[PDB]
Structure 1
């Protein structure tokens, strides 16, 4: 029994969705969308080079065809990520083997933005993984096809650490842990690794986490556990929970279906609910992770009639608290972005203290120079009552 047993998705009307968007057709299996409580960033298909569309959340409805876009890369953009401590700073990686950090004006884009604030060059081939540090300020992680993970200081354009002798094959995704001291990564050799970047060591590793050649994901939870999505020999999509201390056997292992498309997990630390989004699917499944067996409880599934090309999750700070909304997903179609609202049906119209605990604020706990020295601090928590 949980309050989250009743969570149902209600897509907004067409007038709040964003239409006339040429969503990029890159085969790379990324989210294709980054959203903060201020703007909405969607990777779009550019005739030359690469670009992604950044627009204010208010600019709903039809989107201008000649709407200025962030076109600075010489190749198509693979992934984007908003800075957690700055709603106007966004990072993007492309196949031009470089990472560009942009500064979006408060009112949006009036002319096509081409010049980025910083250009990070440390990779030999395309960079498809960009992950901002949860706590340390101006610390960015970049992972490309060259099987190297680089830490970038966007404030000083300085490469803090380099780690290339940790992944022998293609890296799927990288997820920072709670305090930003460790990060997990899924590799093409079906191995899940936990790496300490400040020491350049392999804290833990689980070989053959899933027995499927299909891509696998791995994310860090708030309690320190690792949630992984993968496939079996017969392409049976699976979910698994791993304790870093005990990696001989997974804590849980549940099979979903036999459909193609990698499962991108969207995990909310406040609610301890993971939203399993599969590329090309038309349904979103959410599960609750608790300390009670089987540690993975299926809640329900939001179903639609249209496959999604991408998915973006709006953080806690931008949710409508008074409407008992605990997640908002911006489903990307081939030509439309349709926000979908996760809600908990509550009879009372007052503030739900249990549904909205203290969440990480937009204020960085530490800085880049202090994080290098081994200092660690949990994210600064704010309140959602206001």
Structure 2
């Protein structure tokens, strides 16, 4: 009664040793507010600065220490890369968006790159402006969403290189980000006109919309939670960063509204559906704050804050399949400096050394539930769950 009942009230972050880091990485110098990093249980993808065109560095997780300045990179784009995303159903497939107005899907060899990679598997050209937003479909196989600066949302079929859907007259201004819902049937998006929109891509209709969700003129974000709610980070009229939770059946007032500080830089939320913990990392900030979203008011409970002395240029979150379960790890973040990628370990302090059943429920697996053809027809399904108990050592 005195203390709010929770399991993650004492989660603390701990950076790995210097020999487990990745040094000598020329991280990109693009003003675009993206994660600049995508990590899967196999490789680590970092958007790097190229002399000409654009490239991102893909190296195996075991390739720690200093990276050779001549290490082969995925340099196929004629312009600097903006967003990268690993395929959830394929650890060796990564999609990249760039300002050359095209989306390139790559196939990474199992041992990494021995020579620079210039040819992609698919070249998806459907945008007239730079593509800075990339999001794979969580359930449907080979379905990819790309949103460019032309305020259009496109659904691709990676296997067949077809244009499944085109959503052009739904965003009147620049798009900040998009996030699929739990089953991949809807996606929410934050726009520059201070509006949060929930969109069904297959029907091309606007399910919901909140005008002036955040009153600040600074960029905002909008993501979907597992229970179907909308979590947004934004700014106020007094330029004070806030946090908001929205009920899609009632958008009149937010369920919660908490202010954090009055610093600049967009807040990038990283959400863990298994633990219902949202990690908010600000670009240029030196601290990581995590909140727990529950059904008890105020629906947004501050847990703690991991602090450091170096601002971050980017951040990547390792999925549940790549975490060390035996050490009570619930999240691993690859903090990006300007010349280094420092993994950060978020762990739950537990006295017992056995497998923790409550900390690790069934998580989404690397197997797709549906396919692109079936998803188009109107089929909906939840992600296929796997067990992390086999990963315990």
Same fold (TM over 0.5): yes
Give the superposition deviation at 1:262.
0.2
How big is the shift at 1:235? 1.1
Distance 1:235 1:382 in 2: 43
- Mapped partners of 2:278, 2:106: distance in 1: 30
Deviation at 1:71, TM superposition (A): 0.1
| Residue deviations 1:295-316 (CA, integer Å, cap 9, x gap) | 0000000000000000000000
Quote the Cα distance in structure 2 between the aligned partners of 1:341 and 1:371. 36
Are 2:118 and 1:114 aligned?
A: yes
- After TM superposition, what 4+ stretches of structure 1 lie above 6 angstroms from structure 2? none
CA distance, structure 1, for counterparts of residue 315 and residue 29 of structure 2:
14
User: How far apart are residue 30 of structure 1 and its match?
Assistant: 0.1
Deviation of the 1:234 alpha carbon: 1.5
Q: What is the CA–CA distance in structure 1 between the aligned matches of 2:68 and 2:375, rounded to whole Å? A: 43
Give the aligned partner of residue 320 of structure 1.
324
CA distance in 1, matches of 2:219, 2:196: 12
1:234-293: CA deviation from partner (whole Å, max 9, x where unpaired): 110000000000100000000000000000000000000000000000000000000000
* TM-score after normalising by structure 2: 0.98
- Cα distance in 2 for partners of 1:233, 1:340 equals 34
Q: What CA deviation, in whole Å up to 9, does each residue of 1:110-167 have, x standing for no partner?
A: 0000000000000001000000000000000000100000000000000000000100
C-alpha distance in structure 1 between counterparts of 2:239 and 2:367, whole Å: 42
Report the Cα distance in structure 2 between the residues aligned to 1:228 and 1:242, rounded to whole angstroms: 8
Instruction: Describe the superposition over 1:52-110 as per-residue Cα deviations: whole angstroms up to 9, x where unpaired.
Output: 00000000000010000000000000000000000000000000000000000000000
* CA distance in structure 1 between the aligned counterparts of 2:129 and 2:72, rounded to whole angstroms: 28
Please give the secondary structure, in 1, of the residue aligned with 2:206.
Answer: strand
- Does residue 123 of the first structure (1) align with residue 106 of the second (2)? no
The Cα shift of 1:3 comes to 1.0
Matched positions, count: 386
| 1:23 aligns with one of 24, 27, 43 | 27
Alignment of 1:299-338 (within 5 A): 299-338=303-342
Query: 3-state SS of the aligned residue for 1:312?
Result: strand
Inter-partner Cα distance in structure 2 for 1:153 and 1:246? 34
Shift of 1:233: 1.1
Any idea what SS the aligned residue of 1:371 has?
helix
- Aligned to 1:364, what secondary structure does the other structure show? coil
- The offset of 1:32, in angstroms, is 0.1
> Hey, what's the Cα distance between the residues in 1 that align with 2:124 and 2:296?
44
Give the Cα separation in 1 of the matches to 2:179 and 2:230.
10
Q: State TM-score, norm by structure 1.
A: 1.00
Unaligned ranges ≥5, structure 1: none
Gaps of 5+ in 2: none
Instruction: Give the aligned CA root-mean-square deviation in angstroms.
Output: 0.3
* 2:43 paired with 1:39: yes
Q: Is 1:56 aligned to residue 60 of structure 2?
A: yes
